[PDB]
């Protein structure tokens, strides 16, 4: 199957795994290691979170 | 003509099939009695593509489209998409649409000229629909329901809407869709005419439970 | 008085006694019926359980809401380097049951099996079989007389095989020896086969194939001394209760004035024998095949071993059987795969599978990557590295 | 399940034992549904019957129009929260427990369903399909 | 379209009922383990026996009362059909009998349980149960003859023709052997069915035909409406009257030929008697079987029907032979139209 990427981590999800909850928007977000989920629920800033793909982008961790 | 059938023991043909003037989509795991309902009167006329959408078999509610194009949810797998592109004629565009109001088939109601969309749809999406289907799009509600594709069966000949739709909306909708519209029911009392039957300019397939009066209105308004 | 509310017993009386098994090698209590019209072959195989992982394949079940959709499935993998043949043993039918009348051995015995016949290898003079081996010297005559006898008598022939444990990441050196009934036709043909295969080697593809239903015979994981609650799935008594609560409140009525055989009691748990059946072979691996864990749909050259390797096991560098689902026993245990005792028509058995994907990510954490190739790609260049 | 449920249903993790209250997600006037029974559930001493996605329950309305309160009626579970697992390998969950009031045959009392609806329920109860927006 | 009357279950006899109760009580007593005083335990057993005695009677009698719509409650067509078979007046006393019996058994059961519950004496407690059984035993036996009447009728009501008196029906009448049964089968699209009915010689043929997505029911009367109503017995006369509730339209077939074995004069008299009575329902008179028909009879027929002069239903006759299948569909449309197109506009 194709890989849905756990958005927060941005990691590719080898077709199964994780949970969805509804933003009550049109799309739903997929969650990896619960660590990923909890931080998300924590509503922490991906810009700050090292693990996040976002971290990479903003950090200099990159180009 | 107009025929009756069932997917298993379900009369909601519109849930498991999608019919246009240039193609027909049917759920992958149907029975011969179900498939025949189409094969018997479509013959080698138009492609009858078996398929799944996002892994499900409720392809009628999961998609929307007409002769020029077909809209499929984002979750449509690349395998299903490749299979569709290969089976359907080249003149039809297949586009993934990202909308979460409901299933595409409930949000969109169209023929080859006009399309009604869920009244809360965003502008970007409404333009995409008009673009891919090459049709005029209007946000509307049929008798108050926002799930237009679920309460309206439409062809280029006529249309059937929720039985409680006022005559005033019927008159206005007729003008808007450019076809005669009449409030009615399908499958013995169901007001979900959009999901209970599929129809195009030359054939209408509904459920075995559609009464005599209901089938009369169908072959009369869709001119079959 | 009379229960009050009826409920089913806790636990199955047909798996008593719940005591430790007499050996880590669970016994094959039965073999397939013999059809002496087919070629000669083994009917079981030895291997070692290594790990599990996940599979994706499309399903084929006309009528299911999952017909023609992908499913994801747990499977286990058992390390399976060729068994080596070293004896035949020949049984005869008596009014007191099956009794063996001879055993004929290969002339050369590997250190691996020899080690099995000993309790302290390092000290021993390793004399095992050193006089038997001589019986070959002479033209061959007494080994013929035996082989001959087996043919003359003998209702069933089994083969003594043993595993090539050294071809396995295990520490354990001492190999596993065991009897395997031969089912190809004709008692004579059987022993000929046996004789021809001494010292010679047999591989799983000669015994199992894709989509076959097979059984697993193995000793269950051990747990030591278990209370009644976990061992039998008795109700916890209430919080309020004095003098402990993972127990059975009533151990019996007043008569018969004896605790009875049918009530749950604290005691050993696990390390039991089990003959689990109907496990589908979803893959028959080849050790001399890069792209073991690769697929028709996958393609990427990679073997079944996970990143970091099978946790608590090691690598897999030989043929293996990939069985759908899960099997009795644990990582590292000798385990016997057996041909099925009946021809199952199931449809469920019969369905022919084709893997689309085999998971290959590290099982030592929440693995994100199949190959180290993929990992470098996603991650970038690191402070070690180039 | 049972009457009017065309289709079978693959087992899914039971989320809602008797006594549980889910959101009413239709426009019937009901604010919540209090589960008193699951249909087609079996028997084991001490076990609560418990529903899941697309199960038909028997409920009363704790909060809502008085013409709906003080009585028992059928409802159908449409969203879960206890995570369950589909045959494509996925463990998924909604943000709320919710179902919709319905008749023994399986017809919605209301005309809309507010929020999403899991496909396993949609697939099970056609009149629920009809009134659903975003499915899954 | 179905029978309300079918649903009542068959009543078991008194004999079956006597044995079952005691056996059940016997089963119950030894299984039970009474706790408490010795005297109390025995008393408890006897109480248990008495209560299964009550239980078994109450269950049978409730089955007669349930299942059954009450004879008054049903629509006038349906009331009638029951009335012929039992006799309604006999039926009203009989319903009450079931009710009375149920009340009495409950009353006696209560009486004995209390007395036993009250008593200390073992002999007395035993005797009391004995008495109760004796009393229960007499009651079922007395009622056996009403049980027998009820059981027999249940079967007869089940046989009744299941037809709807509300929706439009077409009625074929005429003397016997006129060719009404054949006319009906030709008229119906699907194959004809047979419905059993009391006090009809043949049974009835029932068929149905569609024009549009409207359904029209057809039944013929053979033996019931065909001959003088007065001449028939009180039960059969009542059966003829059930037809009144039932028909929305009446068609009168005449067979002029005397192949039916009856003259035209007789047929005109029967027709004339029925005709003013049903103003409310539409009439279409059809002179069918025209090909064979003789001119001598035609003169008599002409005098009632066509002539404005005395006795005339005011309808215009269609010549046809349905049997021959000439004009079969033409006659059929008109018959439905006369009552349908009317009734639509009317309401």
From Swiss-Prot, chain B:
GO terms for biological process: assembly of large subunit precursor of preribosome; cytosolic ribosome assembly; maturation of 5.8S rRNA; maturation of 5.8S rRNA from tricistronic rRNA transcript (SSU-rRNA, 5.8S rRNA, LSU-rRNA); maturation of LSU-rRNA; maturation of LSU-rRNA from tricistronic rRNA transcript (SSU-rRNA, 5.8S rRNA, LSU-rRNA); ribosomal large subunit biogenesis; ribosomal subunit export from nucleus. Keywords: Cytoplasm, Initiation factor, Nucleus, Phosphoprotein, Protein biosynthesis, Ribosome biogenesis. Its main location: cytoplasm. The modification Phosphoserine is found at residues 174-175. One of its GO terms (molecular function) is translation initiation factor activity. It is found in: Cytoplasm; Nucleus, Nucleolus. The keyword Protein biosynthesis applies. The keyword Secreted does not apply. GO terms for cellular component: cytoplasm; cytosol; nucleolus; nucleus; preribosome, large subunit precursor. InterPro entries: eIF6. Phosphorylation at Ser-174 and Ser-175 promotes nuclear export. It comes from the Eukaryota. Pfam families: eIF-6. SUPFAM superfamilies: Pentein. NCBIfam families: eIF-6. HAMAP family: eIF_6. Belongs to the eIF-6 family. Present with 18600 molecules/cell in log phase SD medium. Monomer. Associates with the 60S ribosomal subunit. This is Eukaryotic translation initiation factor 6. The gene is TIF6.
UniProtKB/Swiss-Prot annotation, chain C:
InterPro entries: L3_arc_euk, Ribosomal_L3_dom_3_arc_sf, Ribosomal_uL3, Ribosomal_uL3_CS, Transl_B-barrel_sf. SUPFAM superfamilies: Translation proteins. Methylation at His-242 by HPM1 is required for proper 60S subunit assembly and promotes translational elongation fidelity. The modification Phosphoserine is found at residues 23, 155, 296. It is found in: Cytoplasm. GO terms for cellular component: cytoplasm; cytosol; cytosolic large ribosomal subunit. There is a cross-link at residues 38, 135 (Glycyl lysine isopeptide (Lys-Gly) (interchain with G-Cter in ubiquitin)). Its main location: cytoplasm. The modification Phosphothreonine is found at residue 102. Transmembrane segments: none annotated. Keywords: Cytoplasm, Isopeptide bond, Methylation, Phosphoprotein, Ribonucleoprotein, Ribosomal protein, Ubl conjugation. One of its GO terms (molecular function) is structural constituent of ribosome. Disruption phenotype: A mutant confers resistance to trichodermin, a trichotecene toxin produced by plant-pathogenic fungi. One of its GO terms (biological process) is ribosomal large subunit assembly. The modification Pros-methylhistidine is found at residue 242. Component of the ribosome, a large ribonucleoprotein complex responsible for the synthesis of proteins in the cell. The small ribosomal subunit (SSU) binds messenger RNAs (mRNAs) and translates the encoded message by selecting cognate aminoacyl-transfer RNA (tRNA) molecules. The large subunit (LSU) contains the ribosomal catalytic site termed the peptidyl transferase center (PTC), which catalyzes the formation of peptide bonds, thereby polymerizing the amino acids delivered by tRNAs into a polypeptide chain. Belongs to the universal ribosomal protein uL3 family. Present with 450 molecules/cell in log phase SD medium.
From Swiss-Prot, chain D:
The modification N-acetylserine is found at residue 1. The keyword Secreted does not apply. Its main location: cytoplasm. Methylated by RKM1 at 2 different sites, but it is unclear which are the 2 methylated residues among Lys-39, Lys-105 and/or Lys-109. One of its GO terms (biological process) is cytoplasmic translation. The keyword Ribosomal protein applies. GO terms for molecular function: large ribosomal subunit rRNA binding; structural constituent of ribosome. InterPro entries: Ribosomal_uL14, Ribosomal_uL14_CS, Ribosomal_uL14_sf. It comes from the Eukaryota. It is found in: Cytoplasm. SUPFAM superfamilies: Ribosomal protein L14. Component of the large ribosomal subunit (LSU). Mature yeast ribosomes consist of a small (40S) and a large (60S) subunit. The 40S small subunit contains 1 molecule of ribosomal RNA (18S rRNA) and 33 different proteins (encoded by 57 genes). The large 60S subunit contains 3 rRNA molecules (25S, 5.8S and 5S rRNA) and 46 different proteins (encoded by 81 genes). Component of the ribosome, a large ribonucleoprotein complex responsible for the synthesis of proteins in the cell. The small ribosomal subunit (SSU) binds messenger RNAs (mRNAs) and translates the encoded message by selecting cognate aminoacyl-transfer RNA (tRNA) molecules. The large subunit (LSU) contains the ribosomal catalytic site termed the peptidyl transferase center (PTC), which catalyzes the formation of peptide bonds, thereby polymerizing the amino acids delivered by tRNAs into a polypeptide chain. HAMAP family: Ribosomal_uL14 (MF_01367). The gene is RPL23A.
UniProtKB/Swiss-Prot annotation, chain E:
The keyword GTP-binding applies. Keywords: GTP-binding, Nucleotide-binding, Nucleus, Phosphoprotein, Ribosome biogenesis. One of its GO terms (molecular function) is RNA binding. One of its GO terms (cellular component) is cytoplasm. GO terms for biological process: assembly of large subunit precursor of preribosome; ribosomal large subunit biogenesis; ribosomal subunit export from nucleus; rRNA processing. The keyword Transferase does not apply. It is found in: Nucleus, Nucleolus. GTP binds at residues 174-181, 220-224, 288-291. Residues 168-340 form the OBG-type G domain. Belongs to the TRAFAC class OBG-HflX-like GTPase superfamily. OBG GTPase family. NOG subfamily. Involved in the biogenesis of the 60S ribosomal subunit. Associated with nucleolar and cytoplasmic pre-60S particles. Directly interacts with RLP24. Present with 28000 molecules/cell in log phase SD medium. This is Nucleolar GTP-binding protein 1. It comes from Saccharomyces cerevisiae (strain ATCC 204508 / S288c) (Baker's yeast). The chain holds residues 1 to 347 of 647 of the full protein.
